[PDB]
Copies of this chain bind each other. A is one copy, B any other.
Amino acid sequence: NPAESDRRFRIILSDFMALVFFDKIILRLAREAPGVSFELLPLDDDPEELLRRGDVDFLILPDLFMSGAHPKARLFEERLVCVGCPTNEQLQGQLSLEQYMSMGHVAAKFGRGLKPSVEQWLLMQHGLKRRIELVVPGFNLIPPLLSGTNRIATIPLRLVKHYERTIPLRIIEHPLPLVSFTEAVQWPALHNTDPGNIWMREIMIQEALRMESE
């Protein structure tokens, strides 16, 4: 049976991916197969161990982190942007890093063991002293809380397109380049032979391709 089993699958992803990726995927299988269930989950600190053993069936995440001890398929690429509130005023006209420094910034959890202290010593040792005034858990909350303030942030670009209708966002000429990145999904080794996980992976890669047509 290709896609009509009662097999629950366990996925580990970020809120950005769920709201830009799996939403389509759930709609495909919604009409096509009402037999499969899922259980989205959040990112721990040792996701691999969960993969060393089994439990979860996938880990969608930026690749720079994924290790080489397990399968790894490629999905799509995304870039980052420095956004800010339209109502802000000092942001009309490209500005120096000086302003970037002074202006306050928002940021995301990116994990669990934040230990906010260490990051500064680093960036400051490279020549940047940013003042983080608001830390939140994830990306999806950056757009709603920023609007109405004199603060700026760095988020993936696909996000600002999602909120164009509801939250007017202002793409900003950053004083420095905007390295981008690729997204991947990895299946626990010792299970590349399962019947169906392959079908799932296919579903995913497929949508990714579809999604790259823009």
Q: Which residues of A are in contact with B by a Cβ distance under 8 Å?
A: 5-8, 15, 18-19, 22-23, 26-27, 30, 34, 37-42, 44-47, 49, 52-55, 62, 64-65, 67-69, 80, 82, 97-98, 100-102, 104-105, 107-138, 140-141, 144-145, 147-151, 153-154, 165-166, 174-179, 181, 189-190, 194, 196
Q: Are B46 and A69 in touch, CB under 8 angstroms? A: no
Number of copies: 8
Given A68-B6, A132-B37, A134-B38: A124 touches B97 (CB 8 Å cut-off): no
Given A40-B136, A52-B53: A26 touches B68 (CB 8 Å cut-off): no
Rank and list the top 4 A-B pairs by shortest CB-CB distance, nearest first. Answer: A127-B176, A7-B68, A125-B154, A126-B154
Residue pairs across A and B with Cβ atoms less than 8 A apart, 18 shown, are A7-B69, A15-B140, A18-B136, A23-B147, A40-B134, A52-B55, A54-B69, A65-B116, A65-B117, A80-B127, A82-B125, A82-B127, A101-B177, A107-B125, A108-B125, A128-B128, A129-B181, A165-B166
